[PDB]
Design a protein around this ligand. Structure first.
Ligand SMILES: CCCCCCCCCCCCC/C=C\[C@H](O)[C@H](N)CO
Ligand SMILES: CCCCCCCCCCCCC/C=C\[C@H](O)[C@H](N)CO
Lengths: 58, 242, 245, 297, 242, 49, 58, 49, 99, 48
């Protein structure tokens, strides 16, 4: 299965299930992304995380 | 000469069609990617962030649009007065339209899961007081007094070192998902009401200011989901762009 | 070993000697919601013997020229008991039912009744008669309560649908020469696992005389019909103040 | 957490659906077995009691003297995917040049398949239905003539901003799905999913959708299921100026992956309005045909 | 450039075509299904249910349309009189058109298998009597007297505790399936006749009513099948809908 | 554009151009343009015999 | 065979034989349903069932 | 978007063409066949008479 | 004041039940939110006029010219994507011509 | 309409001519003394 790896997602651990009829991988279908989230990157971006049941400012 | 016969669904451009298309540049390898911080993988990462709720959407002139983000609490006569009330419908037109939940749920049609409002007190340290934050589920009209609003879900909040409390508006629906409420047949989908009542009073010593302000912060929980992407409705565009 | 029945649910009891049998609707016994079908996270209250019991609504007089009566469920139990107070205070509701229609008469009386359960029984009008006025029924006729409402056109059931095909639903007969009771058990039928009791009526109970009551002069002319119904596996959720409608 | 005996021996919280019945495979019709005379007492299968409400369990092996008939007749054509997977006219939109209904080159059509009698009467045999669909648009001039014209078929879900004109802003279809087609090409055809907030659509809603004091003015809300308002379908002639061909769009809906619950009596009177089981009162037609007498034919 | 050549059967929309079509919404997962009771998997589950047969289709005015579901039996002179007769053709225009068999067999063209009519007596308990319920197969004209009708299939019914009897109209056809009968060339497909004759009489004591009524209930057997779906013919629609 | 409706026996025959039977909810129908190739359908053995 | 399970029949023991050329399973052909019936759900919905050869009201 | 290119021999109806066509009725199972005597399998059975 | 959001669940605030949620997060992804074609540009080729009267037209590629598609991409400040353009030519009246 | 809220039995005349209403033990106390008009109406068993 020889084909150029020239999409804008080559170089990531995300899994894709694509269909292509050409040698150019940027032509492929969008596919199914991996359903992974990182909510604590925007919602709890603190150095020393604190527990729910605790008081945050001790 | 392989035999084929064309079915209907042909020579049409469906915008939500995901198919393979013809490239213009062969053997093009694009620029490699670096580590940029902030990789958004799912839009539900952004609904869990706490954004300001414009409960006090009374002022209209341009000179008083910053009075719209905080609502006051003052010294009352201790009858269990009413401070503020606001509907809990995010896709509806009101306070939630000033959130990143109420602007992204405009691009979706059907939502599910719990919410959470997070009030924060910006008064003095020497000030104390208590408030009742009641979620009145649907059917309940605007409560006339505090004796009825304690029947719904509620939280009693004591000002202190921790200046903030969370009212987790929970998921109480007949449906699995609910669409956006509006005036008419679609009021069947309303989420309820959220009222704030003076439990005791706002007590203040001498020399401190007699009026404070509360900042509400709205977000979502880990069970929140959205469905059936659409075009946002609560923003327009006058023509002659450029 | 089959004509006698004793129905004990809660603190109430019915004893009958001229029963037919017990119909379980659509092969399903009432149950409580599962952790998969449920979406509401709030814990539901399950008052197990205070609402799950028999309630007797009213009495209807069967005459020679009786056209029929219908009752919407659970509109009949919104002002009656602890069921009609947990429902006014809660926003959701989920219960099966066990209906029981009594009509006792002699061995010199003759007649029949079709006792059918029609789900989502929407009510129509004659549209001015000519079919040109876009009319809708009033509120006393769509949710008429425990008193019921009298069918004005029983052949089309006041909905445009026939009375002859109603035997595809749940049903029993009350043939006064064989039986005087009809026990129907109904599960919760809706697309939603929980639903409001004050706005949505899940089904309608239809009581229609196919064969008219006939008797000879000297006998008892006053022949009543009596509805007696029990919630079963009831659940309530979402607690706020009291509203009637 | 449980100590008393009136909570250990409780049937509270039983979530399993206790079913009396079991679905058995029935690919062919039932075969008949051989039957001879019976001249016995107590065994009486011709006598039933319909007061029980159940139907007769009487076979013809019990009533007459029968032969073995290996029936190899299939039950595959009475399924729902064989009964509903047949496209029918659910709607019809007209785009005239001069007129009053749609004189600005655009047309909105609220999605209801309860507007043509021949397709309404089939789905209203059941009260709950869950299906994916497959719409098909068949555009043409009133005279049947095909013309070289481009169109836009926008699906506007509920809440999304409805287009008010031909040159409006909603036609940019950034999130709303749209379809462009020429009238010379074959008919368009899209597959829709099950898009309800509920577990199934329902063509009969016995109740009011809102709370509130129900009066004479706000009476038309009776019967409105908002779980069924799936949106709005819109058409325009793609252009800045007026067109030069009058058009008529016909919509044909085919169901697939069908499931259905709680059958109903099927209607016999003529429909009059959309999402409304009203009828004419003086003209109540009987279900069938009359006779002169009951002993004659 | 794979070589293909288009066959006839192209750029046509066949309504009974089952093919793959283009979706409008990608990555849409629909609402999960709950247990609703009454899952209809096959329409033949609904033909086996006993629905009322309007044998007495004499009354026409709107005030007497409930007289159409039950036919009477009275005190006769014991000559073997005739009570009622009705054709056994479901797809035909007559009593069976008031059934869920005669409305679903209108959406089909060819049917097979046995039927069953289930009469029920709604008279007094002190009343007794007997009836002969004869199925006269095709060719047989309307029988003039009971002496000829006993030659066909028949059942002798004795009123008592069990108020109901089943006449299983059996499958007696030259064909495997039969289409819908009507006046003309298609009378070749008629199923026969079903007559009801007073065997002895309807006996009643003093003080009980001298006239009763019978309710007929029609259904199908487990061998019933239908074929070749069509559009129903015995219902129309005047225009100007809404 | 044309409509080729198959009306099995018993089904209501269309009396006019703007009739009701052309809605083809259960009757099979075929729409075709005259500029396209000829239509072509395969029928089964449809006899009661 | 990666494909989204998003038809209105996912979540049932019914067997289907479908053809799909997309990632969305609601686009597939209708297929062949399973030929299973439950006639005693509508025709004999009684608690204590009774035999044919017996009298129903004993 | 599988690449294809149409060859000549297209949009023509050849009467002696044996191809697959579109059915009108789905899930139709036709009437089973009985033993009828006289099954003609080849027309050369009839030239020898 | 910490700037982080609340970690408060509803298992901590009310008395709850077990709710096995089988609702998917597959429609909030970016390939489900941006893989929806929208009008990024519109070029006119009149006969008589002043804008493009010589039968040719140049259009500097910017997708920041129509409000409904601009507001979606301007939710983020950096985006990396392959695209799929689609050209839909017609007369102003919607009429198709042999050109 | 109010009396069906208490404990009740619905009795159908027939071959069996007799029915039992078991008035059950619903008391705050373990034993109860004899009721009479006055302070001792606290011990009443109810009504039938
Ligand atoms: C590009 C255009 C695509 C058009 C797609 C339209 C969406 C259709 C959604 C499914 C429709 C199901 C029918 C729903 C029920 C009707 O509204 C009835 N009136 C319900 O009572
Ligand atoms: C045969 C014609 C092919 C046409 C292809 C055009 C090339 C398109 C390149 C990708 C476009 C991405 C959009 C780029 C950003 C816009 O310019 C914005 N104004 C950036 O702020």
């Amino acid at each position: 299965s020889h084909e150029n790896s020239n999409s804008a997602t080559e170089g990531s651990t995300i899994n894709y299930t694509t269909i292509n009829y050409y040698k150019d991988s940027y032509a492929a279908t969008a596919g199914k992304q991996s359903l992974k989230q990182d909510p604590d990157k925007f919602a709890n971006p603190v150095k020393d995380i604190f527990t729910e049941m605790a008081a945050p400012l001790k | 000469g392989f035999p084929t016969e064309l079915k209907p669904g042909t020579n049409q451009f469906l915008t939500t069609d995901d198919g393979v298309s013809a490239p213009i540049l062969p053997n093009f390898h694009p620029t490699p990617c670096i580590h940029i911080p902030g990789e958004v993988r799912n839009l539900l990462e952004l609904c869990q962030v706490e954004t300001i709720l414009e409960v006090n959407n009374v002022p209209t002139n341009a000179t008083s649009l910053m009075e719209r983000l905080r609502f006051p609490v003052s010294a009352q006569a201790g009858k269990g007065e009413l401070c503020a009330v606001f509907r809990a419908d995010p896709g509806r037109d009101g306070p939630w339209q000033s959130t990143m939940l109420g602007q992204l749920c405009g691009y979706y049609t059907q939502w599910s899961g719990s919410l959470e409002v997070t009030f924060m007190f910006t008064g003095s340290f020497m000030a104390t007081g208590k408030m009742l934050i009641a979620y009145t589920p649907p059917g309940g009209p605007l409560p006339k007094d505090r004796a009825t609003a304690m029947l719904g879900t509620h939280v009693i909040w004591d000002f202190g070192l921790q200046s903030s409390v969370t009212l987790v508006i929970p998921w109480i629906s007949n449906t699995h998902y609910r669409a956006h409420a509006r005036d008419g047949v679609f009021d069947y989908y309303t989420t309820g009401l959220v009222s704030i009542w003076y439990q005791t009073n706002y007590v203040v010593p001498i020399g401190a200011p007699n009026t404070a302000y509360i900042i509400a912060l709205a977000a979502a929980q880990k069970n929140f989901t959205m469905k059936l992407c659409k075009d946002t409705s609560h923003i327009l565009q006058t023509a002659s762009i450029q | 070993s089959d004509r006698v029945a004793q129905l004990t649910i809660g603190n109430s009891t019915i004893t009958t000697q001229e029963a037919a049998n017990i119909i379980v609707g659509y092969g399903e016994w009432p149950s409580y919601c599962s952790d998969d079908d449920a979406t509401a996270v709030d814990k539901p209250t399950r008052p197990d013997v205070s609402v799950n019991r028999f309630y007797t609504l009213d009495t209807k007089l069967w005459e020679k020229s009786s056209k029929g009566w219908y009752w919407k469920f659970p509109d009949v139990l919104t002002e009656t008991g602890v069921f009609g107070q947990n429902a006014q205070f809660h926003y959701l509701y989920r219960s099966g039912f066990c209906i029981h229609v009594q009509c006792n008469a002699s061995k010199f009386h003759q007649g029949a009744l079709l006792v059918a359960i029609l789900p989502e029984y929407v009510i129509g009008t004659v549209a001015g008669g000519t079919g040109t006025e876009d009319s809708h029924p009033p509120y006393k006729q769509t949710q008429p309560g425990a008193d019921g409402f009298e069918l004005q056109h029983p052949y089309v059931l006041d909905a445009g649908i026939p009375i002859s095909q109603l035997t595809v639903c749940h049903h029993q007969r009350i043939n006064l020469r064989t039986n005087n009771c009809a026990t129907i058990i109904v599960p919760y039928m809706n697309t939603l696992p929980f639903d409001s009791a004050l706005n949505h009526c899940n089904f309608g109970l239809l009581v229609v005389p196919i064969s008219p009551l006939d008797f000879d002069q000297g006998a008892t002319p006053v022949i009543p019909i009596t509805i007696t119904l029990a919630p079963m596996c009831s659940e309530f959720a979402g607690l706020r103040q009291a509203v009637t409608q | 957490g449980d100590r008393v005996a009136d909570v250990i021996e409780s049937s509270i919280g039983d979530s399993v659906s206790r079913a009396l019945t079991q679905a058995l495979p029935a690919p062919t019709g039932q075969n008949t077995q051989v039957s001879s005379h019976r001249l016995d007492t107590g065994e009486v299968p011709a006598l039933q009691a319909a007061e029980i409400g159940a139907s007769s369990n009487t076979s013809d092996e019990s009533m007459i003297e029968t032969r073995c008939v290996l029936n190899s007749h299939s039950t595959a054509e009475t399924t729902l995917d064989s009964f509903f997977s047949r496209a029918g006219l659910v709607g019809e939109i007209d785009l005239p040049l001069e007129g009053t209904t749609n004189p600005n080159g655009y047309a909105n059509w609220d999605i209801d398949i309860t507007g043509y009698a021949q397709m309404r009467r089939k789905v209203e045999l059941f009260t709950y239905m869950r299906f994916d669909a497959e719409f098909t648009f068949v555009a043409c001039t009133p005279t049947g003539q095909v013309v070289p014209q481009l169109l836009q078929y926008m699906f506007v879900p509920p809440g999304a901003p409805k287009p008010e004109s031909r040159e409006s802003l909603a036609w940019q279809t950034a999130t709303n799905p749209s379809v462009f087609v020429k009238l010379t090409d074959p008919p368009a055809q899209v597959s829709v999913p099950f898009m309800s907030p509920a577990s199934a659509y329902q063509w009969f809603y016995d109740g009011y959708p809102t709370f509130g004091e129900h009066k004479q003015e706000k009476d038309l809300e009776y019967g409105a299921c908002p779980n069924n308002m799936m949106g709005t379908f819109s058409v325009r002639t793609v252009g800045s100026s007026k067109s030069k061909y009058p058009l008529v769009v016909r919509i044909y809906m085919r169901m697939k992956h069908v499931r259905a619950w709680i059958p109903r009596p099927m209607r016999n009177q003529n429909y009059l309005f959309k999402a409304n089981p009203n009828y004419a009162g003086n003209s109540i037609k009987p279900t069938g045909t009359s006779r002169s007498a009951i002993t004659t034919l």
